Amino acid sequence: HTRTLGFILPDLENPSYARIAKQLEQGARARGYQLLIASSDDQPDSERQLQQLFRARRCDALFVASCLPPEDDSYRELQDKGLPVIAIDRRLDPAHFCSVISDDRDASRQLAASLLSSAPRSIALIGARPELSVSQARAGGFDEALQGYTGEVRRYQGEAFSRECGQRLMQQLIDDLGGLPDALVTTSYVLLQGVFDTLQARPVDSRQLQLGTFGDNQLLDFLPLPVNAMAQQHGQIAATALELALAAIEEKRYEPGVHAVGRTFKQRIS
Amino acid sequence: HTRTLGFILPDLENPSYARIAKQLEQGARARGYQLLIASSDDQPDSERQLQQLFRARRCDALFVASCLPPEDDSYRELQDKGLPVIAIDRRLDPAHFCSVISDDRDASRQLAASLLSSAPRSIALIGARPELSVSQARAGGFDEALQGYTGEVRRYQGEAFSRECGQRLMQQLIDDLGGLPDALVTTSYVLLQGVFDTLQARPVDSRQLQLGTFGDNQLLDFLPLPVNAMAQQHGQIAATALELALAAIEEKRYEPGVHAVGRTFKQRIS
Numbered sequence: 001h002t003r004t005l006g007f008i009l010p011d012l013e014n015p016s017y018a019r020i021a022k023q024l025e026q027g028a029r030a031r032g033y034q035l036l037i038a039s040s041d042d043q044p045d046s047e048r049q050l051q052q053l054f055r056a057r058r059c060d061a062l063f064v065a066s067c068l069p070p071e072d073d074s075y076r077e078l079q080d081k082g083l084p085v086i087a088i089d090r091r092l093d094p095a096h097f098c099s100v101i102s103d104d105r106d107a108s109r110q111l112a113a114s115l116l117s118s119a120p121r122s123i124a125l126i127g128a129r130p131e132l133s134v135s136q137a138r139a140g141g142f143d144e145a146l147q148g149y150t151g152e153v154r155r156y157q158g159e160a161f162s163r164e165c166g167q168r169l170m171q172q173l174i175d176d177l178g179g180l181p182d183a184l185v186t187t188s189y190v191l192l193q194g195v196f197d198t199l200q201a202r203p204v205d206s207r208q209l210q211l212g213t214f215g216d217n218q219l220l221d222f223l224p225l226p227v228n229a230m231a232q233q234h235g236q237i238a239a240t241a242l243e244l245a246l247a248a249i250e251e252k253r254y255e256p257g258v259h260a261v262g263r264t265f266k267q268r269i270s
Numbered sequence: 271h272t273r274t275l276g277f278i279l280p281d282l283e284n285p286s287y288a289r290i291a292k293q294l295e296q297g298a299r300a301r302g303y304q305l306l307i308a309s310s311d312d313q314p315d316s317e318r319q320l321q322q323l324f325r326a327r328r329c330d331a332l333f334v335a336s337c338l339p340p341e342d343d344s345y346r347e348l349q350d351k352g353l354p355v356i357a358i359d360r361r362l363d364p365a366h367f368c369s370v371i372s373d374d375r376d377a378s379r380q381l382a383a384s385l386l387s388s389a390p391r392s393i394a395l396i397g398a399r400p401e402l403s404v405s406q407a408r409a410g411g412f413d414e415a416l417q418g419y420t421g422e423v424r425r426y427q428g429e430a431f432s433r434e435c436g437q438r439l440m441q442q443l444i445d446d447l448g449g450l451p452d453a454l455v456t457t458s459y460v461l462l463q464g465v466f467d468t469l470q471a472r473p474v475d476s477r478q479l480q481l482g483t484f485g486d487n488q489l490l491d492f493l494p495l496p497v498n499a500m501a502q503q504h505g506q507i508a509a510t511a512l513e514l515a516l517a518a519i520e521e522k523r524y525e526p527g528v529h530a531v532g533r534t535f536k537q538r539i540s
């Protein structure tokens with residue numbers, strides 16, 4: 001024992017991760033545990049460096065939102081040395097790991113549907129890291145909502161969940177369309193931020209469209225342009241995840257499987 | 271050497287700290303170091319517990335945005351035991367320690383002064399943790415800008431740098447004046463969020479006032495209501511703090527003193 005828990009997250013400047021980390025931290029403290037946090041910046045190499053670190057540091061349990069390929073076995077080895085591994089946000093192998101995630105597919109499908117009920121001629125998806133399960137789930141959801149859609153569709157999967165990537169992708173989209181799409185879905189608020197930057201760089205009378213995004217932000221309560229938002233239940237995700245690590249630690253019970261937590265739908269567009 | 275560095279920060283959900291931590295991390299990685307982060311929630315008890323943790327982890331050096339008194343001798347003990355301690359944001363004893371901070375007093379003064387030039391009939395300060403050094407400097411700069419001012423002045427300083435606390439103070443202030451102040455200065459963006467919440471309960475037409483805040487946010491670029499902002503140079507702060515950490519690590523060279531980094535003034539109010 002060390003009475004400390006580890007948390008590997010991909011982006012410190014992504015407020016959802018900080019929210020979850022803070023939540024994990026507070027609950028853990030109330031249980032007599034300390035939380036040590038580190039970021040991999042969504043890079044496999046860097047995550048692996050942190051792996052050996054928390055392994056040697058001998059934390060009692062490890063929370064991780066991973067970016068490693070599904071074929072990667074590395075966490076299996078820590079788990080065999082006794083280290084309970086709890087996946088967050090990005091699921092790990094359901095046959096060996098316990099994971100706490102969101103209903104990404106259904107949330108995405110439901111997000112794209114609400115935009116269709118408003119006549120979209122064209123519609124686009126802006127996302128990142130298409131190789132990750134989480135993006136595939138959100139892409140698949142977007143596609144399911146498109147069942148029998150006849151308008152133009154475009155999908156952009158960037159190289160990172162970032163504001164800059166969102167700006168770049170929104171730029172490519174606008175050039176490919178010769179103008180704004182009728183509707184747009186961003187798979188993360190961080191991406192939506194970059195989208196706003198691009199809409200900003202155009203005239204005021206040139207920034208209007210059906211908008212829907214994963215996540216949410218106080219900003220959206222003030223923006224003239226209405227935006228549908230699918231927000232995580234951060235507190236629930238952290239509560240459920242902590243439960244599992246503590247059960248593994250204090251009761252030597254661990255049962256592989258996914259625990260999905262539905263996102264909350266904020267419909268800012270009537 | 272463990273090739274790890276530690277960072278004690280007050281609030282994971284304060285974007286400025288998340289920003290510094292990320293900057294610190296990416297820079298530290300490029301120099302072959304890993305960064306472990308932990309939060310204190312601005313409580314002396316929790317911070318002392320983390321104290322014990324990072325020394326057990328025996329990190330090479332420790333960054334800390336402390337909430338501890340000028341009468342808590344804890345970082346002196348740690349420092350004498352050979353661990354380099356480096357203050358960020360909140361200064362530690364300049365006789366012993368090496369701190370990286372903003373020009374809080376001058377930033378606040380310049381900020382309040384910019385609101386005054388509009389000749390408000392009243393102006394208010396909203397801050398928190400009045401006992402903290404950083405808070406005393408910010409209240410001071412505000413007071414200075416106000417010399418000679420003849421209008422109504424209000425000062426509200428809360429229990430915590432939080433959105434919820436910002437909301438409560440704003441509500442107290444409005445009941446005080448029987449309406450919005452003509453001008454308002456917030457000492458952290460996190461507090462301003464609470465102010466925005468309070469403003470939203472009012473008609474869309476009863477939300478105008480001259481606003482100045484510490485911190486900055488993308489939202490302030492899209493707001494109809496312009497906001498003057500003093501943004502930290504997060505990257506410069508982290509780079510300097512890191513430079514001081516390595517030198518102390520790999521040269522035993524460590525000269526106390528305060529390295530100030532000016533805030534960037536975003537003057538949206540004409």
Ligand SMILES: O=P(O)(O)OC[C@@]1(O)O[C@H](CO)[C@@H](O)[C@@H]1O
Nearest residue numbers: 016134161187188189214215216
């Ligand atoms: O969806 P939000 O709460 O706005 O942002 C969080 C998020 O979408 O960004 C991550 C990229 O790593 C996803 O894995 C995660 O669900």
Ligand SMILES: O=P(O)(O)OC[C@@]1(O)O[C@H](CO)[C@@H](O)[C@@H]1O
Nearest residue numbers: 286359431457458459460484485
């Ligand atoms: O001023 P910002 O960048 O919006 O927020 C950062 C900050 O104001 O919040 C902390 C409250 O503890 C201060 O120490 C720090 O300067």
